[PDB]
Amino acid sequence: EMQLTPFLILLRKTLEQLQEKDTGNIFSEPVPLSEVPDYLDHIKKPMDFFTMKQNLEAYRYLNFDDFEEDFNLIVSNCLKYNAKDTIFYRAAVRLREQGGAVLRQARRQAEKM
Ligand SMILES: CCn1c(=O)c(=O)[nH]c2cc(C(=O)N(C)Cc3cnn(-c4ccccc4)c3)ccc21
Numbered sequence: 001e002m003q004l005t006p007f008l009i010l011l012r013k014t015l016e017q018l019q020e021k022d023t024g025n026i027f028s029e030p031v032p033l034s035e036v037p038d039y040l041d042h043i044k045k046p047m048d049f050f051t052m053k054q055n056l057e058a059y060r061y062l063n064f065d066d067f068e069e070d071f072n073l074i075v076s077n078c079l080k081y082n083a084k085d086t087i088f089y090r091a092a093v094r095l096r097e098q099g100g101a102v103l104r105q106a107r108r109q110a111e112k113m
Contacts, residue, residue, distance in 0.1 A: 002113040004062075010113075011056055011067055014106040018071060019049045021098045024091055027074050042081055047073035064107050071099060 022028055028049045031039050040046070047070050061067040078092035 002110075004059075006113055007062075007110065008056065008059075010106060010110055011061055014067070014102060015049065015052055015056060017102045017106075018095075018099050021095055021102070022049065022091075024087075026088060026091060027078070027095065039081065043077050045073060045077075047071075047077060049074070064103075064110055068103055071103065075099070 019028055030046055030048050030051060031043075033039055052067075052070050052074075055061060055070065056067075061070075075092050075096045078088055078095075082088040082092070
């Protein structure tokens, strides 16, 4: 089955592709709790692309499903916290759409390995 190194290269490229869909850069660093003091009274597990990069390099993603789970958390946390009539909520909807396409293609390339 798969060698670890090519899979990690693929997750690195995929994470880069997902982060470039975040043109507002509202998903690339942890939500700043000092500015949003009630954030964790609603969000059980915050996630963002910088944390995902840390997890990737700590070897915490060894299959696609776990990588995709943390991406889905970025989206679902934002949909949960923010009202529907906000830029944030709509940006999460857009990321879900555009990121889903990136992830389907990355899964296809992994299925070659
Ligand atoms: C509505 C809750 N919220 C979400 O729900 C969401 O999905 N993304 C959010 C993204 C930000 C955001 O501006 N960041 C992550 C950039 C940043 C990182 N540090 N500082 C900072 C630090 C010190 C002072 C000023 C700013 C800003 C904010 C809220 C967010």
